[PDB]
Design a protein around this ligand. Structure first.
Ligand code: FES
Ligand code: FES
Ligand code: FES
Ligand SMILES: [Fe+3]
Ligand SMILES: [Fe+3]
Ligand SMILES: [Fe+3]
Lengths: 170, 446, 449, 170, 170, 449
């Protein structure tokens, strides 16, 4: 897989910066419409801790996952953070994303394979603070308005989640 | 008084106090049967999982001989954790510090340099990793540290009447799908245990948004409006050893959006349940259950999430979430149930995500001295319950009700007060004297 | 001993020990009047704030009827925190676990499904959120958990003589400006309490660079050198219920760089203060105060920062910082006082930022067993203090001294030692025996001029 | 609402990196002289937690703020760190900044509206560590061929600050 | 003192992103071969807390350091993660790197002086999480169409390391 | 029983229980001599370091007459830590809160405004920072809080026979190089202590990878092969006050890859060691030691890492790691030893990084009540040990054995059971009765040769 040119790199980073702004400002409908393809698979597998001698395969979409969603399932998830009226989210919890190490590769047929590191800082109420780190593996399509994601795989670094929930998008 | 069974209230200290917690560890967790997993998690000989019994790490292993055994996951040399893998297949486990080798039942089977350095003087028979008693009920695997405990069969007791409906059902019963989600939640273990054993009340309030979105059957619950005859719509149950649940009739698949296979499965098997277990239990088979098995296992039958609340002191738990599925369901039906159960009740659950603060706030509010020397009320439906001519145990008239709270805290108190199992067993015939309305159902059903 | 009132020392255990802290919660925080806020924070019917009494969460509400009430922020069903808002306007508060509804006084006013599911068989009278006794003084609102406690006015006691100077003043008194800054600090609550009650000594050492930078009146203090006749420059005060403060003369606005409106307001109003309260209290009205109200509220009058030190166990606090301003000041003055007060003493304060290690180190050094079995000294100026012919309580000769430490710890000891309020009241007339120099002020003033 | 060219974005990123390095090396006088406009308003509001139903407006510069400074006031703050002998800062505490999600927009008249995520890691003494996240909203103007900030609004993520102070610049 | 052109800047960032990827995926041999020069000095000094009045010089390579390695010594370190069954790393622990504030300067002889900020998040077993922040000071040279590092100095922000070890590369 | 010396087992409670830890603080850390450093860390008049004695912070200072003193790093005013610098040179230390000035021995020598504000009435001689007894052995510096403790020489006791081999050696002895690495490790302080005192057994299992890569002498330990006569290859030693070590013959520089200078230094000095101390000690001089000095100091002689395990409660330590080097080695040799020592055993050590989980898991596994009410076995080699005709104390036949564990826990039990030093001393004649095989070495050595 050939690394993208610096100008393509730029556009990919710009796209991810705008995606993060949508998340941070609660513009989830606009994100689904403008940034996510209708054939999306949005996937966060549960990885167990295994001995190195263990030859079992890595998790597939048929196995346990925290997220394993199509476009309609994402639309469903997004609406919770509208309308609430969800009392834990009155007022909305705060979230801030630090995306780093974006590397893209041309994948044929106009598509891109993109890796990135994500740090997510969350605050709510008076003193509640939680932090998550993840890898992201995307496939992006070019379209008439930039890029849309059609496959997103999120790899959590922590086996045991030190938070009340993982109810945020990446 | 920590629990008042007469007036159905509890001290806020039960969610907060360190000494109360230490007594729980002694008189509940070191005495009771605790959920370890299911044969489906360790299906082949040599298969194991690592898990907890309260704050003790344990290894559960499918033995080469077909039995299931468990042991404390701590080396008999200097104490190190024997195995760190969540799951695998092992003929032996080796401690990583010096290489002592443990068998599938925790026996010390070999030590490096046994002849050269120990001069064959090491008494390996006395150095097994501590065994834990293991018993199975319909494929579900429980452990117990107390050799005086009743059998698992007797600990479930009359609760088996209910569990047989679903864990035998049309004949295939149910199993667990892993790997589990695992998360820390800063609450006492009893807050979620009581929420699942009996908290129909909260559903329409906390989850009003989720129910309006999902639409369909359970949607009516949203907002807990006064005009609905909830009592025409379910029941609640408690038993001698604290186990209980509420049921919403005809709502098993109510929170699933994609449910063709699960809905069809129930349609196809309900007739066999009616035959084997009677129409009274066919009713349950098609209902949505919120259930806790005393002390710290809970599940939703219908939505099909399955949870163990592992305590980490009085103000934290580690929550493990599996999916529960019928064994005889087609693989695709099992996978769809798993996706819907995780989307509603997993770590990013559209419903579960709503509950975190309910649980932690009920706990941590008691940081304040004036606050924790207050009490909590669980009187909802008191007197609208009692022995039933068909259903064993004690039955309340609605899934919105606190019958099962009352049974939970009653048995919690019984255990905390008893110096041993013999003392508990002494009370077997009189346990339900605190439910004074003995003619309620006869008079009501007439 | 924990506190030696003869020789003016304290055990290091008072900043560290868990059982001492637990006795404080029971015998001070569960007993005393604690600062909840001010009418200005809850000014209209229905207006509420959430705050702390020690480690208990409380709601304070301006009732439809114009009175103020408070209650524990914990639902009587399963205990859930009722309200998470810092402030707002509400006729009711709804517990969001199951929807129990609480009135502005904490009454249980609605229970969802009461008929259907409770069968109207819930005694809502026994399920009010727990009440907190509230009284007010010059708009400042306090709470108390002990029904045997004296009135707030008797609890402030002779300290009202001082407070009336500024909380009535020319007629308009003072009020609080929020929202508060809130921050955690890993220290015992008493370290900042004592620092504000009486610590003129640290100012010239710790804040030397802020003082020398600002210049002006207070800048002379920088470095703590012998050059200056400090005692000519101010006084220190302590009272029966531990309340105390230091005053630097004619320095009220000395830390404000933009101070036109504030200085003008003092000049414009000092006359009426002289007429009402006399020359001796006009002196105080123009001075810079560093004050603590027993147990855990503090303020600087002049700089105009106002602090509550909410304990979180013996080795942490949550500090809430408001601005205190005269009600009768112009809005532009009020906003300018707020800016200057926050720039100096807020979470990024040019002075306050200097002190955080002074507070935490004094506490956490006691992790060591040998260390904590030591003691602390507060003997500075001992015997240069006593009862005064005009000013009530006990007066010491300088803002640089430890009269107010000694007063603070004496009362702390009295309360910690007392099984109930009756036993405290039983020594109202002999509290100040530990200050033996009765004719100190007679002799000082006679011999003077 | 016009996003900047990649060449302008690069220059802004370069400006912010140089600013961070001035902060990390204590060159506060260089920062103030070269990177801050004399018409600066430096503002960090206090945001209270309110119910969604609450219709009161957001904080303005007439309300409580942790910072609310003009140039002369920043100069004063600077000199405490740059020149004072402050015993807590003997030797200087350590600070490291991670600036992410920089998005700039051409405003009128050569001015830029610039949005930024900031993560601040602070260490002092032996084991003390504190961590802050915030949002930054700048108005910059070109100061060829660099920039100077003339409005800076800093949005703290945490309601209760878990640190001794907030005595650092962003 | 000459900052690099934007194109050279991009190339250095892309080099660093590839480096990070190699660390995160355990490709240490490939790293040593392709990204590290044979005349490397890889150095992580121990900085003590000293009063400002102290006039003693900064640590040099003749003083205590956590790392103080030539190429052969780096090779030795790299194999511990290969040529050994190391039971703490069965399975390997997780590591994720957030590299920011990369500033490069032309240093003479075609060599580049490069500053960067590093945040390193590590997870292992069930609930273990440790976090490190460092400054990195590199000298790089051009090697083919990329770069190799020939001097790397790592400046830890924490005096007392709050982790079992510092057995990771930067 | 917490320690069973008859059957050589211990309760897991010793790694976990908070009350056991409190007893250790009282009966070990406040009783014993603890390692502070070495003259080389404070080599000139005025030089100082900050360090710990368990959880107490201390200052150690080289006085003007070349003696050393130490004192608790806490101000006698309000308790503030006096000095935050790791090291430096100071004729006085000034507390940052109010500026009280302490001398090199902790005496309070000056206070700001002593005349003006204290009226010269502060009794400064009663307000010294608390002294700690300081004694030195061959340049190594120890402290003790217990007035009744025996001399440092008597506390080392028969262990000095061993230490003189290397801390005197050919005449130059050894010194420490700093600054130290400092890290937190979530383990009980005893797990590393025992690991270093006697755990030859883990080396070939845990460090097999590191060993295979280094090659040479110690590489043959990898995988712990049953065909090797380990007892031909070393010995293990324990002594009356808990100190012990294992030795691998001829392997001193075995983990060092670049070792020309160190290997030549040993070759050039062994002759004189044989002369002074005998071939029995020349053997030790050329060997690799793993050593603990009771309670919480450990070192590897040969690899030359030197560690102090400072407790932070029962479930945490702060590890300080120095390099130990011969004084007479060339500067180039000392530098090379430090690089190799750090590369194997520092915070990023190629060996040390393997051991963290072994330490922490043995501790935290005891979070579970069923687990912590279990026991730990240290029986390896029992009965293959006894008094020796040449070597003092109790000697075991292999560096792979638990002789030194048994000695360590025997002394721990003795200290914990003893209300004072007088009770300990009363065991001096019967301390080793728990090693029943009294004729083991006489039969063995006679059947040999
Ligand atoms: S601790 Fe398990 S083999 Fe030694
Ligand atoms: S906990 Fe408040 S309504 Fe149930
Ligand atoms: S605390 Fe040390 S001088 Fe006051
Ligand atoms: Fe729920
Ligand atoms: Fe101050
Ligand atoms: Fe080791």
């Amino acid at each position: 897989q050939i690394p993208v040119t610096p100008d393509v790199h730029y556009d990919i980073e710009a796209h991810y910066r705008a995606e993060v702004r949508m998340f941070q400002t609660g513009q989830y409908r606009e994100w689904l419409q403008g940034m996510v393809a209708e054939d999306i698979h949005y996937w966060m597998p549960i990885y167990e801790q295994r001995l190195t001698r263990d030859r079992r395969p890595d998790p597939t979409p048929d196995d346990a996952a925290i997220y394993n969603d199509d476009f309609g399932e994402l639309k469903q998830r997004v609406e919770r953070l509208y309308s609430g009226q969800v009392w834990m989210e009155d007022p909305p919890s705060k979230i801030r994303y630090f995306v780093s190490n974006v590397e893209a590769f041309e994948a044929g047929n106009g598509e891109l394979d993109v890796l990135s590191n994500i740090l997510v800082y969350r605050n709510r109420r008076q003193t509640e603070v939680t932090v998550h780190t993840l890898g992201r593996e995307d496939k992006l399509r070019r379209d008439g308005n930039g890029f849309k994601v059609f496959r997103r795989k999120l790899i959590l670094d922590a086996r045991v989640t030190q938070d009340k929930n993982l109810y945020f998008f990446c | 008084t920590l629990v008042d069974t007469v007036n159905a209230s509890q001290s806020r200290q039960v969610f907060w106090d360190e000494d109360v917690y230490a007594l729980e560890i002694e008189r509940i967790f070191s005495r009771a049967w605790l959920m370890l997993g299911h044969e489906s998690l360790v299906p082949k000989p040599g298969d194991f999982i690592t898990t907890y019994m309260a704050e003790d790490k344990v290894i559960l292993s499918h033995q080469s001989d077909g039995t299931f055994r468990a042991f404390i996951n701590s080396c008999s040399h200097r104490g190190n954790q024997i195995c760190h893998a969540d799951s695998g297949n092992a003929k032996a486990f080796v401690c990583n510090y010096h290489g002592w080798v443990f068998g599938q039942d925790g026996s010390l089977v070999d030590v490096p340099l046994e002849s050269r350095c120990y001069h064959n003087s090491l008494d390996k028979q006395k150095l097994a990793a501590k065994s834990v008693r293991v018993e199975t009920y319909k494929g579900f695997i429980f452990g117990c540290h107390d050799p005086e405990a009743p059998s698992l069969e007797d600990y479930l007791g009359e609760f088996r009447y209910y569990l047989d409906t679903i864990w035998e059902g049309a004949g295939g019963g149910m199993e667990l799908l892993g790997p589990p989600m695992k998360s820390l939640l800063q609450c006492n273990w009893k807050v979620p245990a009581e929420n699942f054993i009996g908290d129909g009340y909260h559903v329409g309030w906390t989850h009003a948004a989720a129910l309006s979105q999902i639409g369909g059957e359970l949607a009516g619950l949203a907002g807990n409006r006064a005009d609905i005859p909830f009592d025409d719509l379910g029941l609640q149950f408690t038993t001698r050893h604290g186990h209980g649940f509420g049921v919403i009739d005809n709502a098993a698949a109510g929170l699933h959006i994609k449910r063709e296979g699960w809905t069809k499965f129930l349609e196809d098997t309900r007739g066999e349940v009616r035959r084997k277990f009677g129409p009274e239990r066919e009713r349950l088979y098609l209902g949505h259950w919120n259930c806790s098995i005393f002390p710290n296992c809970s599940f939703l039958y219908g939505t099909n999430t399955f949870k163990i609340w592992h305590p980490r002191g009085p103000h934290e738990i580690e929550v493990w979430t599996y999916t529960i599925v019928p064994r005889d369901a087609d693989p695709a039906t099992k996978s769809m149930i798993q996706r819907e159960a995780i989307r509603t009740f997993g770590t990013a659950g559209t419903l579960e995500s709503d509950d975190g603060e309910n649980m932690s706030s009920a706990t941590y509010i008691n940081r304040g001295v004036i606050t924790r020397n207050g009490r909590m009320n669980s009187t909802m439906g008191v007197g609208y319950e009692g022995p039933h001519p068909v259903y064993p145990g004690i039955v309340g008239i609605s899934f919105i009700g606190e019958t099962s709270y009352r049974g939970f805290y009653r048995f919690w108190k019984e255990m905390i007060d008893a110096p041993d199992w013999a003392s508990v067993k002494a009370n077997d015939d009189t346990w339900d004297s605190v439910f004074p309305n003995r003619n309620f159902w006869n008079e009501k059903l007439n």
